[PDB]
A paper describes a structure:
PRMT5 plays an important role in the regulation of diverse cellular processes via dimethylation of target proteins involved in splicing regulation, cell cycle progression, apoptosis, the DNA-damage response, and other functions. Due to its involvement in these critical functions, PRMT5 is considered an essential gene. It has been shown that PRMT5 inhibition by small molecules can selectively kill cancer cells with homozygous deletion of the MTAP gene if the inhibitors leverage the consequence of MTAP deletion, namely, accumulation of the substrate of the MTAP protein, methylthioadenosine (MTA).4−6 MTA is a weak, endogenous inhibitor of PRMT5 that binds competitively with S-adenosylmethionine (SAM). Targeting MTAP-null cancer cells via selective inhibition of the PRMT5·MTA complex can improve tolerability relative to nonselective PRMT5 inhibitors8−11 by limiting inhibition of PRMT5 in normal cells.
Glu320 sits toward the edge of the pocket and is solvent exposed in a position that suggested it could be reached with an appropriate substitution off the 2-position of the benzothiazole ring. To test our hypothesis, we extended basic amines into the region via both alkyl chains and rings. Utilizing an N-methylpiperidine ring gave the best potency in the series, again with good stability (HAP1 MTAP-null GI50 = 7 nM, human Clint,mic = 10 μL min–1 mg–1). A crystal structure of 51 shows that the N-methylpiperidine engages Glu320 in a salt bridge with a distance between the acid of Glu320 and the N of the piperidine of 3.9 Å, consistent with the distances observed between ion-paired amino acid side chains in proteins. For example, addition of piperidine to the benzothiazole in TNG908 to give 51 increased potency by 14-fold in MTAP-null cells and by 30-fold in MTAP WT cells (MTAP-null GI50 = 100 nM and 7 nM and MTAP WT GI50 = 1600 nM and 53 nM, respectively for TNG908 and 51), decreasing selectivity by only 2-fold. This trend was observed throughout the series, i.e., when Glu320 is engaged in a salt bridge, bicyclic compounds generally had poor selectivity.
Residue numbers in the entry:
A (entry chain B): 27 to 206, 210 to 328
B (entry chain A): 13 to 637
C (entry chain C): 14 to 637
D (entry chain A): 316 to 637
Amino acid sequence: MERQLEAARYRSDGALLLGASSLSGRCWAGSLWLFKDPCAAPNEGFCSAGVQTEAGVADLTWVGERGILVASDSGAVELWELDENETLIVSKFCKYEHDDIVSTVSVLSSGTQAVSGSKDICIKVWDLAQQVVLSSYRAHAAQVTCVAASPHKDSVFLSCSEDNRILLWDTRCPKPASQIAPGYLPTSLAWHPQQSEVFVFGDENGTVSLVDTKSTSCVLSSAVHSQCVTGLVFSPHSVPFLASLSEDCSLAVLDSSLSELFRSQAHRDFVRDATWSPLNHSLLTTVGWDHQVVHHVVP
Amino acid sequence: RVSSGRDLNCVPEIADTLGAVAKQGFDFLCMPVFHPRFKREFIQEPAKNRPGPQTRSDLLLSGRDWNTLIVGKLSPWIRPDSKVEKIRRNSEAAMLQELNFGAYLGLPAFLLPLNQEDNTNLARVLTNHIHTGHHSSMFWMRVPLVAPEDLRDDIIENAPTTHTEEYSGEEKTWMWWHNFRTLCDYSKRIAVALEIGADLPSNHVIDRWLGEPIKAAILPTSIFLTNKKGFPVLSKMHQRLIFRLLKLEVQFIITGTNHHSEKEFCSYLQYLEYLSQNRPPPNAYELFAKGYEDYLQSPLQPLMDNLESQTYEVFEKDPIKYSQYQQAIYKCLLDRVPEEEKDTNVQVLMVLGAGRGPLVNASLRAAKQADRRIKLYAVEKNPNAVVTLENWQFEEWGSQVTVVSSDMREWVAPEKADIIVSELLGSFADNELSPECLDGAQHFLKDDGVSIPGEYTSFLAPISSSKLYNEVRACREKDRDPEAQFEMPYVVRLHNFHQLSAPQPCFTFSHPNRDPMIDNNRYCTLEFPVEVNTVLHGFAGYFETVLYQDITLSIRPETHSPGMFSWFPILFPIKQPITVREGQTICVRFWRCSNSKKVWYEWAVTAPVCSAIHNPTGRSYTIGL
Amino acid sequence: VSSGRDLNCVPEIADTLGAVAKQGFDFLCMPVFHPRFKREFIQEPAKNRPGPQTRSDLLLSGRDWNTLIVGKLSPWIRPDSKVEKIRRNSEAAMLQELNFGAYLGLPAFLLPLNQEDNTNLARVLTNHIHTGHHSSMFWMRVPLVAPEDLRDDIIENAPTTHTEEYSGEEKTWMWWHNFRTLCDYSKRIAVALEIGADLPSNHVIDRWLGEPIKAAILPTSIFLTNKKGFPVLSKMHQRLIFRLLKLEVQFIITGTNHHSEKEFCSYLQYLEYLSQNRPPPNAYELFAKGYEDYLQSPLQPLMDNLESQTYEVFEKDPIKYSQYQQAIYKCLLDRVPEEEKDTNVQVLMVLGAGRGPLVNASLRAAKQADRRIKLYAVEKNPNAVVTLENWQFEEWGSQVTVVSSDMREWVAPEKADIIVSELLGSFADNELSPECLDGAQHFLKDDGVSIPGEYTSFLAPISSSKLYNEVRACREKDRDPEAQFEMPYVVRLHNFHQLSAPQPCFTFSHPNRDPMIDNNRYCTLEFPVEVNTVLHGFAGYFETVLYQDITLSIRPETHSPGMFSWFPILFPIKQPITVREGQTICVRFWRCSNSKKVWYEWAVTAPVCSAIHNPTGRSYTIGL
Amino acid sequence: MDNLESQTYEVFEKDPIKYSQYQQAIYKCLLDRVPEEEKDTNVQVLMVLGAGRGPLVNASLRAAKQADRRIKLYAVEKNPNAVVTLENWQFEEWGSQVTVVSSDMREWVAPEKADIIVSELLGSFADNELSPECLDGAQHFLKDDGVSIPGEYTSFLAPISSSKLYNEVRACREKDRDPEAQFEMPYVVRLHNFHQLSAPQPCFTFSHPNRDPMIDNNRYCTLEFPVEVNTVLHGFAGYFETVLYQDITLSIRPETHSPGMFSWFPILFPIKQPITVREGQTICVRFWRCSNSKKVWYEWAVTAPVCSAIHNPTGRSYTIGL
Ligand SMILES: Cc1cc(NC(=O)C(=O)N2C[C@@H](C)CC[C@@H]2c2ccc3sc(C4CCN(C)CC4)nc3c2)cnc1N
Ligand SMILES: Cc1cc(NC(=O)C(=O)N2C[C@@H](C)CC[C@@H]2c2ccc3sc(C4CCN(C)CC4)nc3c2)cnc1N
Ligand SMILES: Cc1cc(NC(=O)C(=O)N2C[C@@H](C)CC[C@@H]2c2ccc3sc(C4CCN(C)CC4)nc3c2)cnc1N
Ligand SMILES: CSC[C@H]1O[C@@H](n2cnc3c(N)ncnc32)[C@H](O)[C@@H]1O
Ligand SMILES: CSC[C@H]1O[C@@H](n2cnc3c(N)ncnc32)[C@H](O)[C@@H]1O
Ligand SMILES: CSC[C@H]1O[C@@H](n2cnc3c(N)ncnc32)[C@H](O)[C@@H]1O
């Protein structure tokens, strides 16, 4: 398996999906892996499925239960269907429509569409069934860092880029992009699960902030990490915790008021992705470039 | 045809990818050397001590391949001008790492992007690096024609793209370059890789880059329109641009993925190749001058120096000019000797400065074309050419021609002249001292005689060309003033430059000059209105000359005698470049000065700002009498 | 062979050029004005003689003039005549013919030295050279033996003295050297050495070692006629021709066809045959032939990180790594006995690994000897650490540990059984191997081994006006005008003269147990010289003991054969120094240093004193 | 890097105000560190790092008796020509109370850790004599609760017009070096005929002791100077302020100048080409403090209203020797 683990997503039934890249050595490729045993990862021998891609994987997300949406370095969006037996992984499609590395992807509320952001500064709306681009949006002026689909609305999503802009979208509107002091660059976006009014964003300076779109005002923020915040994930908990991942190699779990509850130094390299177990809601799985796959017990 | 390269930010197997782009028809590949998403930490534990390999090995290619086929690329996560101090120091270390590695591989060029106004620390680091080993490695700056901000789709509700007029702002990207370029002190190892987008801006935004060292033009696949067959094509305006870029002989780079997936990447390249072949075929002048494009040469001094053989050879290899001289002589013959007297009145016709005698053969052909009597003299102070002349004379011309080996200022001629024919003009007309030579040779002209040419006039025009400014800058020699190269002119076929105002006449001379108070010194002042923003680096110089009435010669671009490649333009540089904003006027001053031994020019810009006076007392450049 | 034909008679320039072209020659030496066509410049009436003064330039193309025609000064021109009128006239005429040869753009022009005093000839030629900075080369026709010392002893009252004249027999060289000196060592001035029937003592021939000989002139007279009528040469003449071919000089034929049975292609073909029937051009020798007398600044692998292809040429040298492997192997057998082979593993560190040829050598030695080793590859160049770690992951595994740091810095985990280095320059310690190993010593076991265990530098005085001029041309703006003479250069020496046997300069031993470690040195060397010559510099070589009887050397006497990893080093001197036969050259050398720099100073103190070169390392320092 | 001559030290010592301030700072620190009752039982180890000919030593003594506390003294100096004077003094006058240590403070393995360290390693631009690196090396032998006098310092810059001084610099061109090297190096000079174009602003600050685990004495500063006049930029004047102890400070900055003190003159950073500045425009200048294992140096460039070249890149024209 390639050393640099990029993504880790839990399925509803407890199965773990992993996306790995090789960022050094002769071959710069990527791979997808499915572990129906979560504690057996990362070992390749004890896996439920696996596949090798032409190119590495930057971001990754489920499509329901059998679909796997991949943003590849090739500039392509690849959709990988799962096998009838859930033993093989097969490429349903792979479209080269972005001009540069596709850096982020997310699936919308309807589950029949997705949104992608690339280093080519463009955002693209995809019909996963028809397998075409519906809208191509050159709204930013720098490479698109993160795109986060709204959980409860099909036409709405958030995006953030190195042009220091956070755009709230609405494809129904004629000018779908809407911008909301210019601090340090935004790096990660996470809608709040129960309140589609508010969300959170991390910056490159290691500060995580909480925003209410209605009040269009930064109600709160906290200096969690010493370095860039690469990911933000809420828990499915009734009152949801917030996980924050950084390049300082730490994981931090925060309350509703952005205070530090949990913090793990177990990783010795970058922390990439983190998903909570939908089986045991107090368990949290993190991955990184030290090829570690850690399971965290959260009080 | 075209030299080309392919731009990629994804290379899974370097060998396979290079083979693919080689079979696609490309001449080289631009690729990253470390993985573009493989951010590295240098200061802080633990990722500081991340175990290698940090990238792929150098053994994967041959030194041949590294040296000729691979343009390196700076990873995009590196931001040396970040507002964050940590990212600043880290990007510094990473930029040093990737650059030193590209040098370790010995890459012919390395790409770095300008995509914001402030790249001060980027320039600081790159300058530091360049001054560590006097290496060859070129550095291409990826600069967009239109900033991504001024190119974004107007789809933001509360941030509308103003559809207003902003002359200066539309040029902002050039400004970026010019600032960066300036901080690095005009390093010859720093060039432009101009990137081209969908919407092309006003023609002045494009013209800003005239005279800039563009080595590469970057074409994305996005800007390619899909024609009736499904092929990739470009707009008519894009094609006008591509022609302009091809004259500068820049390399063309393809970026983006295959949107016209029906075909293969050879389709874009083949559109280009087709365009290059379907270019107006090179007329005789252009092929000769193409080798001398922006090539500097010291002005010849046929008076002080005796010219070599092949120099005369290239002078003679120019039919148009001698056809004109023959026609002028012919018309003057018809005017001077009436029809009835053709057999009884012979004309004394002296070629002053004969060389190897093309003017002599021209005088003969004119004499018979016009049907009149002439006695000929061929005066020449270069004895090495007098050899050729006397061989011709003995063998062919006979005693009709008299070869006179002396300076025309010295020669006590036997009989006064009916016509005197000269060729003593430089690229700046009088810069070979034709006025003084003819003034000395004038006394032995009949009180009603003719000088061919009868008149000449120099022309000047301000020009921007950081390219040629750097070429001059590199002419500094040991054992002389460090700035002497800026205080002397150069003969050069100007190519990559920007004319900033219409040429205007500088100095005129008329022969014969009957004036009792002869003074060949001059003080001229020229005001050039400039309707663009630009940077003054020098002044181009041309000339016009009246041989006889309506027969004239000119290298001036507007009135250029067509097909004539005897002269190239002259260039008067200035030490410090001068910014000029749209609407301002460039006021330049010129002097023709002399003493008993030397003649020379001085010059200075007095508006919009003052320069220093150039070549004062001819201290750096004199023309020997 | 590149060749030309010399003629003082050309009736039709076109026909003559065609003839010599069909004969197989590459170029023609001919006069440009007629050789008997003496001209007057001062005094009437012949002053006003009507032209043409010679034949036209139109008779050839510019390509032909530029590539095929060597001009020749008419022999009636005598700028050093004792007669004032002939002096001024020959001045004007020499200017005329030279300026004309430049007008034609000739690649070379011939002028003769056939007496002791050519002072005014040099004055005029120097004046001309400083009138337009043109390319035109000037070949000086100098005979090996003066015609006086070559005449037949058939004068009753003027006998050729049959005594021994060491200095006098070299007189022609003196001529050249004086002329050459008055023209201030102009690179546009070279030698066209002319060869006669009687060859002199071999020291007379050796005088021209290191001189810029571009052409060798062979007359038809000196060609022996064999049984068939062929033209051939003596055995000694052939020894000479081989020597001249190594310098790659052009060969010119002069004289008429005495072997009139044949055609002039016979003379040429004898040469062509000789040149093919020499040891065929090696791979080693053809590689180094491009670098003949080519100057390069010494690499500094400590201060500078070496490029990739530099390492590539370092590795492409089998003999040296075979030696290193054998040394490691013998040391292994000595340290670990036969019974312990599986129970005692040896810690073996490659300090300065590069791209790891020494690592593969250590491995091949470990298995050739059949012993256990644990390996470390230390390297401060990260661009090479890339290659190393790629190899390690792919091939070596965890047996090797790649350590990316300076050996003076590294806090190693466990002490070493063996340390293997490669930090030698052409002058041994000039890449600061002593300081690096001194820093890397503390983590060596109290009974461990350093490969190499010893090294020693060697120096020898050399004459080579050629290389002296090459150095002279290295003057740069924005620094001292003489800095180029105060710095060494790596160069495959070729056209030069060794004046005394190499002698050892500086030696270093590792491990250096000495409690008072001082890598500074003050050495004095006395080189007896058995010839007249001119000292221009000092060649430098090295020897190193890797282990016991396994050594490396570029010293010409003890040269490791077939090894092209190093070229010799050259320490020049600003002013050349004359040395008469029997005298002794006394050179002094210092190895100096502080916390940051190391450098050499040097000076000649006998037969005369030079200045101290590179004082305070002002012109050359080696970075620590 | 250089060992100072005798009369150089002599002019350093001929400045009472400064040593009065140093004495007062030492005195206050003594009162703060050793309480009243312990005056006889707790002796303070007080090291003069960079002692010269020992005016700071006599100042430490006068402060010890003015404050009435016990001190053991060390006078460290790497200049042996001044160690001569120091040891002569010590034998004759100070006795064994003072210990003269002839070595670099970055080298010296001191016997016992220090209560106070007193330095004088400031130039006209504060850190331009490399006081940060010297004290960073000499820091390890300081007690984990000790004091550095001075505890802080800060450099100051201001753009100046002076065609006079520009011509003076222009005339400093030397043979055998870059024709423009004189513009890429600073000069110490009592500025006189010149025009200050904007208020001085702080450039670089250093604090001692520097506990920070990630010590980096490199700096990248950007200064924006509003200019309310038409003029021509020729250079930048440089001054410094330093906190010896709390409210005892020194300054050559014209606004906050310590009065009567003539130990330092201002420093001048020139630029190659003069730059026109119209009223209302802002001069944006950039400064770097750079270093390696052997050298420390400054680079600088004007980025507004126009761009200059980067001055002294890679320290090619000016390096400060470590
Ligand atoms: C009739 C006439 C023609 C001209 N024309 C020119 O001058 C001129 O525009 N061009 C440029 C182009 C057409 C080529 C010839 C010539 C040129 C210029 C500058 C140098 S410098 C040099 C070197 C001299 C020294 N040797 C060793 C190398 C060449 N050659 C040259 C040649 C001027 N005046 C008169 N009357
Ligand atoms: C293992 C070892 C080997 C050597 N050997 C030599 O040094 C040496 O004799 N030779 C001469 C010949 C064989 C060629 C390589 C090398 C050389 C010398 C001087 C320069 S100068 C330069 C330039 C550097 C800058 N780049 C841009 C161009 C090349 N390369 C070179 C190469 C010394 N030490 C060690 N440890
Ligand atoms: C305590 C302290 C003080 C200072 N102060 C200064 O530096 C300074 O502002 N000034 C200017 C004015 C007050 C005079 C002394 C000194 C100076 C400056 C530059 C040179 S250059 C030179 C030459 C050296 C060589 N010899 C042969 C001739 C004199 N002397 C000098 C003297 C810096 N640092 C510390 N720590
Ligand atoms: C054809 S370029 C000008 C020619 O005129 C010659 N010439 C220039 N000035 C004079 C002069 N004063 N007398 C004679 N020939 C001249 C030059 O030597 C050259 O051949
Ligand atoms: C193979 S040429 C010598 C090699 O040793 C490396 N080297 C030289 N000095 C040192 C040192 N002190 N520490 C580590 N590697 C070194 C050089 O960078 C080069 O790769
Ligand atoms: C009084 S000016 C600064 C004094 O401190 C001395 N000095 C500077 N750096 C050091 C150092 N590292 N160790 C010892 N003395 C020093 C200088 O030699 C000078 O006497």
